[PDB]
Design an enzyme around this catalytic site. Structure first.
Site, short mmCIF file in Angstrom:
data_model
loop_
_atom_site.label_atom_id
_atom_site.label_comp_id
_atom_site.label_asym_id
_atom_site.label_seq_id
_atom_site.Cartn_x
_atom_site.Cartn_y
_atom_site.Cartn_z
N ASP A 32 -6.82 2.76 -3.97
CA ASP A 32 -8.13 2.28 -4.39
C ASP A 32 -8.99 1.55 -3.38
OD1 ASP A 32 -9.12 -0.24 -6.79
OD2 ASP A 32 -10.23 1.46 -5.96
N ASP A 215 -15.68 4.39 -4.41
CA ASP A 215 -14.41 4.01 -5.01
C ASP A 215 -13.42 5.14 -5.23
OD1 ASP A 215 -13.74 1.89 -7.89
OD2 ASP A 215 -12.43 2.70 -6.33
C1 LIG Z 1 -2.69 1.14 -11.53
O1 LIG Z 1 -2.84 0.30 -12.66
C2 LIG Z 1 -1.61 0.01 -13.25
C3 LIG Z 1 -1.05 0.94 -14.15
C4 LIG Z 1 0.20 0.67 -14.77
C5 LIG Z 1 0.88 -0.53 -14.49
C6 LIG Z 1 0.32 -1.46 -13.59
C7 LIG Z 1 -0.93 -1.21 -12.95
C8 LIG Z 1 -1.52 -2.21 -11.98
O2 LIG Z 1 -1.45 -3.53 -12.46
C9 LIG Z 1 -2.65 -4.05 -13.02
C10 LIG Z 1 -3.38 -5.01 -12.06
C11 LIG Z 1 -4.43 -4.35 -11.14
O3 LIG Z 1 -5.19 -3.44 -11.91
C12 LIG Z 1 -6.28 -2.79 -11.34
C13 LIG Z 1 -6.40 -2.57 -9.94
C14 LIG Z 1 -7.53 -1.90 -9.42
C15 LIG Z 1 -8.56 -1.43 -10.29
N1 LIG Z 1 -9.68 -0.76 -9.79
C16 LIG Z 1 -10.63 -1.51 -9.11
O4 LIG Z 1 -10.54 -2.72 -8.94
C17 LIG Z 1 -11.86 -0.81 -8.53
N2 LIG Z 1 -11.94 0.64 -8.72
C18 LIG Z 1 -10.98 1.46 -9.44
C19 LIG Z 1 -9.75 0.72 -10.02
C20 LIG Z 1 -8.48 1.48 -9.51
O5 LIG Z 1 -8.41 2.68 -10.27
C21 LIG Z 1 -7.69 2.74 -11.47
C22 LIG Z 1 -6.92 1.69 -12.09
C23 LIG Z 1 -6.26 1.93 -13.33
C24 LIG Z 1 -6.36 3.19 -13.95
C25 LIG Z 1 -7.13 4.22 -13.33
C26 LIG Z 1 -7.77 3.98 -12.11
N3 LIG Z 1 -7.25 5.47 -13.91
C27 LIG Z 1 -6.63 5.83 -15.19
C28 LIG Z 1 -5.37 4.97 -15.47
C29 LIG Z 1 -5.67 3.46 -15.27
C30 LIG Z 1 -8.44 -1.65 -11.70
C31 LIG Z 1 -7.30 -2.33 -12.21
#
Ligand SMILES: COc1ccccc1COCCCOc1ccc(N2C(=O)CNC[C@H]2COc2ccc3c(c2)NCCC3)cc1
Length: 329
Positions: A32, A215
């Site tokens: 990401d 992104d």
């Molecule tokens: C990957 O997320 C998880 C999944 C299962 C268990 C643990 C975690 C992480 O811990 C959770 C703590 C960190 O969580 C995040 C980290 C980064 C982001 N993002 C940003 O900050 C900026 N742009 C995009 C996103 C990354 O893309 C994403 C994130 C989640 C999903 C999708 C796309 N696509 C579909 C499935 C969910 C969101 C959440």
């Protein structure tokens, strides 16, 4: 240079594999450019957190190289404030091993983490935005001075390799024509100035300018709800419970969406932003675009995600604080 193979899951999720610990605990992760942290669910994550029940958990007590830290990291994801703690260990990324501090999520809402086909995020963003100010993974790779270039690239295949990230360069085999670079406005974020967004034959959006978050982590392209309500209505997009849609048989006629970046027009034919599941008239087909009201400082700002990346191979150039875009091939 090192390349990480990505798995393309229904064009919404492109993720790869990193190994964490000794022995390497494999994690399917999304690289990401919208975040700057490494997050993986903790083995300490309460089984109550569904996102944890069905996901690879990192078990510190299984890694001989683990270096406890404990510092609690937090971040609210407009769906719930996820929390974990800082941990250190060797993370392998495409043959490259790095001592990396990362977050083990011990608490996180089901939505949307429950639906993730991957278990974590490899933040490719800058340290300026790294929670706990934790040094990002790629900054940590750069420090090794092994990469042929201070840049990493993204190739998101159009489903069926499902994708490919190149640490240290870009793969000519996955783009054609030449890279047209847009500079990063505010440094510390993979964001560029956008000279409006066009609808077929009418610059009726982002006029006067706006910001575009490139992104790699976002499934779709997004912008303030305003812009999206405008955009989607201008396409004939009939909003659903969340995402907007449009009769399948009519997806191919939808107008071209173009984004102006770096003196070049980046056009998405209707086959680029529509999930043309079928061509029937009865069933509805979704659009790879949605409203994402991203909060400052970075937001409001459109976000060019997989939808955009799939057509335009993308390069994130650190040394020059710019982003290259070339016709994905
Ligand atoms: C990957 O997320 C998880 C999944 C299962 C268990 C643990 C975690 C992480 O811990 C959770 C703590 C960190 O969580 C995040 C980290 C980064 C982001 N993002 C940003 O900050 C900026 N742009 C995009 C996103 C990354 O893309 C994403 C994130 C989640 C999903 C999708 C796309 N696509 C579909 C499935 C969910 C969101 C959440």
């Amino acid at each position: 240079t090192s390349s990480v193979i990505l798995t393309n899951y229904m064009d919404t999720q492109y993720y790869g594999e990193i190994g964490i610990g000794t022995p390497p605990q494999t994690f399917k992760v999304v690289f990401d450019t919208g975040s700057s942290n490494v997050w993986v669910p903790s083995s300490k994550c309460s089984r109550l957190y569904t996102a944890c029940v069905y996901h690879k958990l990192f078990d510190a007590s299984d890694s001989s190289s683990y270096k406890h830290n404990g510092t609690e990291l937090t971040l609210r994801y407009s769906t719930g404030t996820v929390s974990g703690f800082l941990s250190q260990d060797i993370i392998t990324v495409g043959g490259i091993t790095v001592t990396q501090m990362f977050g083990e999520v011990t608490e996180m809402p089901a939505l949307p983490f429950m639906l993730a086909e991957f278990d974590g995020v490899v933040g490719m963003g800058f340290i300026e935005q790294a929670i706990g100010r934790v040094t990002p993974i790629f900054d940590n790779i750069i420090s090794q001075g092994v990469l042929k270039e201070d840049v990493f690239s993204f190739y998101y295949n159009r489903d069926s390799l499902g994708g490919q990230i190149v640490l240290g360069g870009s793969d000519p085999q996955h783009y054609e024509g030449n890279f047209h670079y847009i500079n990063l406005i505010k440094t510390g974020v993979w964001q560029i100035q956008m000279k409006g967004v066009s609808v077929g034959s009418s610059t009726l959006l982002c006029e006067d300018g706006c910001l575009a978050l490139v992104d790699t982590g976002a499934s779709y392209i997004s912008g303030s709800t305003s812009s999206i309500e405008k955009l989607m209505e201008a396409l004939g997009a009939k909003k659903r419970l969340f995402d907007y849609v449009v009769k399948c048989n009519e997806g191919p006629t939808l107008p071209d969406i173009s984004f102006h970046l770096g003196g070049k027009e980046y056009t998405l034919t209707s086959a680029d932003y529509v999930f043309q599941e079928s061509y029937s008239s009865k069933k509805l087909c979704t659009l790879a675009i949605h409203a994402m009201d991203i909060p400052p400082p970075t937001g409001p700002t459109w976000a060019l995600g997989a939808t955009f990346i799939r057509k335009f191979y993308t390069e994130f150039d650190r040394r020059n604080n710019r982003i290259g875009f070339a016709l994905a091939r």
